[PDB]
Amino acid sequence: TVINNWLLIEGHTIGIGDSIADSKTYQDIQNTIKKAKQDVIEVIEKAHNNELEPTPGNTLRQTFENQVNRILNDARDKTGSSAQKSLSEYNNFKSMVVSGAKGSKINISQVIAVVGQQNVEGKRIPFGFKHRTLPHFIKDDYGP
Amino acid sequence: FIQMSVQRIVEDAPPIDLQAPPRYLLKFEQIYLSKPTHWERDGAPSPMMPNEARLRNLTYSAPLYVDITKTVIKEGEEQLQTQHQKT
Amino acid sequence: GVKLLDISELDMVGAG
Amino acid sequence: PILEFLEEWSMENLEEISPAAIADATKIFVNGCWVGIHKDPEQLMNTLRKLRRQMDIIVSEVSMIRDIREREIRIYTDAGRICRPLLIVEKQKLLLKKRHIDQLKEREYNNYSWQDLVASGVVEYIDTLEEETVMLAMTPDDLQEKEVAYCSTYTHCEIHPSMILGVCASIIPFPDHNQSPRNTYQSAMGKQAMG
Amino acid sequence: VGIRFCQECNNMLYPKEDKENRILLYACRNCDYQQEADNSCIYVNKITHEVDELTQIIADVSQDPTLPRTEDHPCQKCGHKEAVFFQSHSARAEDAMRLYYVCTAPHCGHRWTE
Amino acid sequence: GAKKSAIGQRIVATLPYIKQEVPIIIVFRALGFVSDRDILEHIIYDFEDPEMMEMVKPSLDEAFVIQEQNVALNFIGSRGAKPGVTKEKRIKYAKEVLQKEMLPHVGVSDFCETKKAYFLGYMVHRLLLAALGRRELDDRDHYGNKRLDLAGPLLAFLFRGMFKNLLKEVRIYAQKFIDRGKDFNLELAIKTRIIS
Amino acid sequence: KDILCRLEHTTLRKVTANTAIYYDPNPQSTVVAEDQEWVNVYYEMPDFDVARISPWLLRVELDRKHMTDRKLTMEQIAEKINAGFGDDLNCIFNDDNAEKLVLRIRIMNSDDDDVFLRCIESNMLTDMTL
Ligand SMILES: [Zn+2]
Ligand SMILES: [Zn+2]
């Protein structure tokens, strides 16, 4: 009763301004994504030239998948952390997350910075078509 | 389905041939569909509008007719071939 | 193909 | 008519070939029935696509798939196959031009409609089987413009990506900004909505 | 490796030993037909199976629009710059992301690997 | 065991209206191809590929005892759903099953047997390309392998069986009158409701 | 890693590159020229060949990579095979001097004659444990 009645004086909301980050934050996120895509391309080129060596206990496909998966995971959480640092104290997403009322830090990162890797049965999207995930790509394309 | 498949289904069905004696043969050749029609208590055809079918709990259906050629052979080297139109 | 019949060519055999 | 056209062309029937000639030739299937073989598959497929795009002997819904790696040409004509129209692309250019758009602007009082678009060989129906043999552009404005090349050989181009959605999912405003379970929930709820 | 057929019934020639001469003969069963077996090898199976994919690659894949094309690797038989590159994507072409390359020039179906 | 895989893994085929899987080369001899070279010509198109040949060795070895079309037809007929008590009925039943039930889309006339043989070769050829890993296994939920029966094909499916019932009914009525030695009226023969 | 190799199940097929059933009726001779050298190294002294050894030959190649990885040597595979089959199979092996790790097998000279070796191959590849 007491907190609900005080909230009429305080009030609490959520809006577009709570999901907006400054231009510097967007530029940092885009730079992180460009770096991640570039190093994924380098890993792909190492794999194509037979320069990538398999780790103990994993085949070469598993080694490549582990490398690119950890790459995209660290890129995603770095972008999410940078977006979290950009949050103001009046930001309502942060107010609802720090209180534990609803949501999580991953929700803020996905709303603001990067939704991240989409996984099916614990792997990246499989080649439903002939060596393709969709008709809009070229065959044997393991890019993000 | 209506324009082609019904015709092909009737045509590719085996012709009927029977014997006890006089041989009988039956063959279906051509198919006809009228519009959706309702027959009242007296039996008068009228065009069945679909709203009437909704309101009166009828079935919005059209009748189906077929031309049936019956060829009877009375084991005398003759074949009497009578064609019932719109059966 | 299936021929269409107008309502006037339907004889009153369904009532008989 | 497909069998008649292929017999008119150099497709060799299975009855009139020794098995020695099958290894170096491409098998031809029509509705899954192996009809014969053909020794120059590329120009055959060019001819078939030319006939389909002109609404010649091949109707629009007939779908032709060339498995180059397995040397097969499967032609399908039966019902039940799902397809959708895609704009044809030639030399990184849409066959759709401003003249077609001008004719379609006066869709009334001109008798120029979608069927004339299909007859002009600008847009063709592609089925999910043939999509495997199709390199498709998402939007013509950027995906096929000259740049650092990703793919310089586009065979088709989408009309608009938003048409992947169904009926109840297409009334969602900004569905690409949502979580997809909630797109599904709205697709259920619009069915349940008053009106 | 060699597979041999009879000359009267064209049935499969099974290897057999003539111990009276200690000689291998590819004999037809149910046809009493015999040949001088000179291959001197009756069975083989490549469990390592490092079999070449350039043998399995068909040059007509140069015509595929969905495949990736590149100018980085010129052809070694005609010097053509454009080439189509792809992976085996097959069992017995075991897990390895290497690229096999096909010359895009017509009438030059040269295959190679880098 | 010890000698099962000594010959190696082989190819069997299970057909409609047969209560037991039959070896594939027996089916080919039943179609009328007794020479092994003719069969492998229908199966393997590149005879300079040893791997396909070692794949088809044990299938040939299993069916080696049968070496004639009539023997293979008797072999198939003995294993039918309703086996023939005599050899003639067994061969006739196997011939009918291969005529009408085995790959009918290829054809139903006897002269299409060659086409059927070629198609059957292609089928096992595809299996070999799956066994050697040269082709990917086809995916079941790949929607290119699907078809949608709409109102049209579905109503055709019903109408076929219902027209069968109607023709059986008018057959019974006409034979009832024919066995009695008298003529029948066609209008009364047709039970309309069987469709309606 | 040594203990890991000691307990992880390794069969013959893991370490073999390929095999081939030759004929080679005279065991002094070999159909393969490279084989003849070390076969003669094992044939100046007779080893169960004074009587007629079976005139078939089963020659297997062992992968150098898997042999080194599993810490396997040439002789102990032959010991395991002889333990499994007694002296029914006379087994010779090339001296460890090159990656071509060749092992020859024949049926005992006291001895189907040919496809029995195929049965033995299908057996030893899978079920036999190194
Ligand atoms: Zn013979
Ligand atoms: Zn070249």
PDB file of N, CA and C and ligand atoms in Angstrom, chain E residues 75-80 103-105 108-110 112, ligand 2:
ATOM      1  N   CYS E  75      43.232 -19.831 -63.752  1.00  0.00           N
ATOM      2  CA  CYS E  75      43.352 -21.189 -64.253  1.00  0.00           C
ATOM      3  C   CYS E  75      44.769 -21.457 -64.740  1.00  0.00           C
ATOM      4  N   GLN E  76      45.192 -22.713 -64.601  1.00  0.00           N
ATOM      5  CA  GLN E  76      46.527 -23.155 -64.984  1.00  0.00           C
ATOM      6  C   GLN E  76      46.585 -23.805 -66.362  1.00  0.00           C
ATOM      7  N   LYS E  77      45.445 -23.956 -67.052  1.00  0.00           N
ATOM      8  CA  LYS E  77      45.399 -24.522 -68.396  1.00  0.00           C
ATOM      9  C   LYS E  77      45.074 -23.506 -69.478  1.00  0.00           C
ATOM     10  N   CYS E  78      44.371 -22.418 -69.140  1.00  0.00           N
ATOM     11  CA  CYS E  78      44.050 -21.361 -70.089  1.00  0.00           C
ATOM     12  C   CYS E  78      44.289 -19.960 -69.541  1.00  0.00           C
ATOM     13  N   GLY E  79      44.671 -19.815 -68.272  1.00  0.00           N
ATOM     14  CA  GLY E  79      44.938 -18.500 -67.727  1.00  0.00           C
ATOM     15  C   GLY E  79      43.715 -17.658 -67.449  1.00  0.00           C
ATOM     16  N   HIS E  80      42.520 -18.251 -67.443  1.00  0.00           N
ATOM     17  CA  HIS E  80      41.305 -17.490 -67.187  1.00  0.00           C
ATOM     18  C   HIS E  80      41.228 -17.088 -65.719  1.00  0.00           C
ATOM     19  N   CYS E 103      37.725 -23.978 -63.255  1.00  0.00           N
ATOM     20  CA  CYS E 103      37.877 -22.865 -64.180  1.00  0.00           C
ATOM     21  C   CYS E 103      36.532 -22.532 -64.814  1.00  0.00           C
ATOM     22  N   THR E 104      36.139 -21.260 -64.738  1.00  0.00           N
ATOM     23  CA  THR E 104      34.848 -20.834 -65.262  1.00  0.00           C
ATOM     24  C   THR E 104      34.820 -20.751 -66.784  1.00  0.00           C
ATOM     25  N   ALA E 105      35.970 -20.802 -67.449  1.00  0.00           N
ATOM     26  CA  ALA E 105      35.999 -20.673 -68.901  1.00  0.00           C
ATOM     27  C   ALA E 105      35.298 -21.871 -69.543  1.00  0.00           C
ATOM     28  N   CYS E 108      37.101 -25.464 -70.873  1.00  0.00           N
ATOM     29  CA  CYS E 108      38.270 -25.694 -70.022  1.00  0.00           C
ATOM     30  C   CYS E 108      37.737 -26.049 -68.638  1.00  0.00           C
ATOM     31  N   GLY E 109      37.436 -27.329 -68.443  1.00  0.00           N
ATOM     32  CA  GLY E 109      36.938 -27.811 -67.170  1.00  0.00           C
ATOM     33  C   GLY E 109      38.059 -28.235 -66.248  1.00  0.00           C
ATOM     34  N   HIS E 110      39.043 -27.359 -66.060  1.00  0.00           N
ATOM     35  CA  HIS E 110      40.170 -27.676 -65.197  1.00  0.00           C
ATOM     36  C   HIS E 110      39.746 -27.609 -63.737  1.00  0.00           C
ATOM     37  N   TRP E 112      41.188 -28.018 -59.635  1.00  0.00           N
ATOM     38  CA  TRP E 112      42.377 -28.043 -58.791  1.00  0.00           C
ATOM     39  C   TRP E 112      41.980 -27.747 -57.352  1.00  0.00           C
TER      40      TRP E 112
HETATM   41 ZN    ZN H   2      40.765 -22.888 -67.630  1.00  0.00          ZN
END
